Amino acid sequence: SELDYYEKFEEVHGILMYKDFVKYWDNVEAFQARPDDLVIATYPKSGTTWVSEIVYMIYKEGDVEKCKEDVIFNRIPFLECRKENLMNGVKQLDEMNSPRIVKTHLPPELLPASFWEKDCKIIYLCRNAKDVAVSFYYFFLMVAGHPNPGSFPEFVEKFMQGQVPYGSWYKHVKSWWEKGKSPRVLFLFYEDLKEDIRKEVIKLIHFLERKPSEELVDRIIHHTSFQEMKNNPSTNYTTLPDEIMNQKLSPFMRKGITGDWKNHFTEALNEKFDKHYEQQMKESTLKF
Amino acid sequence: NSELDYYEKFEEVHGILMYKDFVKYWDNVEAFQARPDDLVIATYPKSGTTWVSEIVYMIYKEGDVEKCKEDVIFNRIPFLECRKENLMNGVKQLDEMNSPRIVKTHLPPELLPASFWEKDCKIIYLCRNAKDVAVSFYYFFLMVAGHPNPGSFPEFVEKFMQGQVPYGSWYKHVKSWWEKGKSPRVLFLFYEDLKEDIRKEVIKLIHFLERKPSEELVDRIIHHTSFQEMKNNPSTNYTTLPDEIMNQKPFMRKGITGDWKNHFTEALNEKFDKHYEQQMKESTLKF
Ligand SMILES: Nc1ncnc2c1ncn2[C@@H]1O[C@H](COP(=O)(O)OS(=O)(=O)O)[C@@H](OP(=O)(O)O)[C@H]1O
Ligand SMILES: Nc1ncnc2c1ncn2[C@@H]1O[C@H](COP(=O)(O)OS(=O)(=O)O)[C@@H](OP(=O)(O)O)[C@H]1O
């Protein structure tokens, strides 16, 4: 049902958003950033947790014992996220000592103005639309606060129209792509992390002005592999109660591959999606 | 669990997987006595049997739609090997028929009763592309009693590629009938051809059956056998069968070519196409 679908959402500045977050939006827009804040921005399900753990490790010189001191969602606050009596992203950040690492799924136009004014470093991670759609679909089924996503074809329709939390994936990646032309905003691809993790890890170390030793690279590559992070309670979100995230249905660290869309899209839906994709993306220099 | 289900529902006869009810009295099919003027309509399951059957029936009745409704199609055109104790019996239906008889079967050439070959009966074979057949066969499994749970479509398609479904390998079925189709008395047709140019195929069928073609006869056959008309015709849509046997909550599902695109994922299509080429590369048969 359409009525029930949007009942869980509310638009903020034109993009559909989780109702709970919108409640305290003023706090997000008035957020006070610091010069050395590091923002990790992504469209939902593009690999946020993966790049977040890599960055954390670079900050802690690859000390695994330091990356387990707390769960990922506490070490790296989810900026716009807030749920009464559960979590408060803005607060965690306000009470955190610099250098702070900020997680967000906001398009660049909605990122709190303070981050832009202080010209903070930003890392953006992009993933192919079809794999994002598959992963986002399971997120709907797993995380509380989501309406029934309908059948997969139905959900993909919502996805193509940008009628999902955080809006149009197309506008999201195209806007960040433009921001990414600046050396201050590192634009990365999930597919690149998959193809040659070492190359991307080294790039991230240099972007973050750190020393790229073999020891550091080795530990990051090992600690951030899918198998390790999937069994690491600090990064696999398994500490969250099932009412919030029921991973018995589908685990957060689901498959961690590129191309899972081939297992979900019918040839017909693939054809429909590809046609729509081209009309949405042919003018952008962004390419996979 | 699925394999056990399949084991409970099907059994082989002459090496071909078959519905258990049809195997218990196979001797009755093996010894079936054909008549010289019998006309056999052979097809792999869900290839359009009902469509060509009604076209042929109309040709026999000089296009008299009323004579084609005197009874349901499964009574007008007995299903040869169909048997379920004393509740259903195709051979019995045929034996009591006062000819000319039109016979429906899904048997591969090797299992067709020797009598049909010995009497050199005319045979019409209808073929349909494998992917669309798999889709339609999947639905058949779900709506008709006597089948195991087919599981997901990808799971069912694996069993299909291995010929582990009633009537066996679709690949061997169409290839064997293709060879038989080289004979002047075996007309080999394609479902896709009936979709592309029904008039051409109907005229071809009229000549094969040695009848005189006329614009009025052809025209009547064309609209009477159209998907939309046959779907609403109780004589041809199998709706008179109780839900216990066939649960249409429909047999006349879509009636198009290409529904496979709405069921195969890119990955399944890739795997299927690869396996298909290995199975069909050595045949001149082309869909
Ligand atoms: N280390 C590593 N290696 C490979 N793949 C990984 C890794 N960490 C996370 N993932 C995959 O990222 C998907 C989850 O995305 P997000 O972290 O962005 O989720 S969220 O938006 O922050 O909730 C999810 O994708 P899917 O498996 O396709 O669903 C995860 O499996
Ligand atoms: N007139 C007409 N026009 C177009 N398509 C038609 C027609 N009559 C039957 N059909 C389609 O044939 C499919 C059923 O196949 P069969 O008749 O062989 O079934 S059975 O094996 O005899 O039970 C089934 O295919 P699907 O729709 O793809 O499932 C029917 O819709």
From Swiss-Prot, chain B:
Family, per entry: Belongs to the sulfotransferase 1 family.
UniProt-recorded Gene Ontology molecular function terms: aryl sulfotransferase activity; estrone sulfotransferase activity; flavonol 3-sulfotransferase activity; steroid binding; steroid sulfotransferase activity; sulfotransferase activity
Regulation: Inhibited by estradiol.
Self-association state and partner proteins as the record states: Homodimer.
Role according to the record: Sulfotransferase that utilizes 3'-phospho-5'-adenylyl sulfate (PAPS) as sulfonate donor to catalyze the sulfate conjugation of estradiol and estrone. Is a key enzyme in estrogen homeostasis, the sulfation of estrogens leads to their inactivation. Also sulfates dehydroepiandrosterone (DHEA), pregnenolone, (24S)-hydroxycholesterol and xenobiotic compounds like ethinylestradiol, equalenin, diethyl stilbesterol and 1-naphthol at significantly lower efficiency. Does not sulfonate cortisol, testosterone and dopamine. May play a role in gut microbiota-host metabolic interaction.
Name the UniProt record assigns to this protein: Sulfotransferase 1E1
Record-level GO cellular component terms: cytoplasm; cytosol; nuclear membrane
rRNA-binding listed as a keyword: no
EC number(s) recorded for this UniProt protein: 2.8.2.4
Residue sites binding 3'-phosphoadenylyl sulfate per the record: 46-51, 128, 136, 191, 225-230, 253-255
Outcome of substituting S136A: Decreased gradually the sulfotransferase activity
Keywords, in A-Z order: Cytoplasm, Lipid metabolism, Lipid-binding, Steroid-binding, Transferase
Bilayer-crossing regions: none
Catalytic residues as annotated in Swiss-Prot or TrEMBL: H106 (proton acceptor)
Organism expressing this protein natively: Homo sapiens (Human)
Binding site for substrate: K104, T105, H106
Keyword Ribonucleoprotein applies: no
Localization terms from the record: Cytoplasm, Cytosol
Tissue: Liver, intestine and at lower level in the kidney.
Biological process annotations from GO: 3'-phosphoadenosine 5'-phosphosulfate metabolic process; estrogen catabolic process; estrogen metabolic process; ethanol catabolic process; positive regulation of fat cell differentiation; steroid metabolic process; sulfation
Reactions catalysed according to its record: estrone + 3'-phosphoadenylyl sulfate = estrone 3-sulfate + adenosine 3',5'-bisphosphate + H(+); (24S)-hydroxycholesterol + 3'-phosphoadenylyl sulfate = (24S)-hydroxycholesterol 3-sulfate + adenosine 3',5'-bisphosphate + H(+); 17beta-estradiol + 3'-phosphoadenylyl sulfate = 17beta-estradiol 3-sulfate + adenosine 3',5'-bisphosphate + H(+); 3beta-hydroxyandrost-5-en-17-one + 3'-phosphoadenylyl sulfate = dehydroepiandrosterone 3-sulfate + adenosine 3',5'-bisphosphate + H(+)
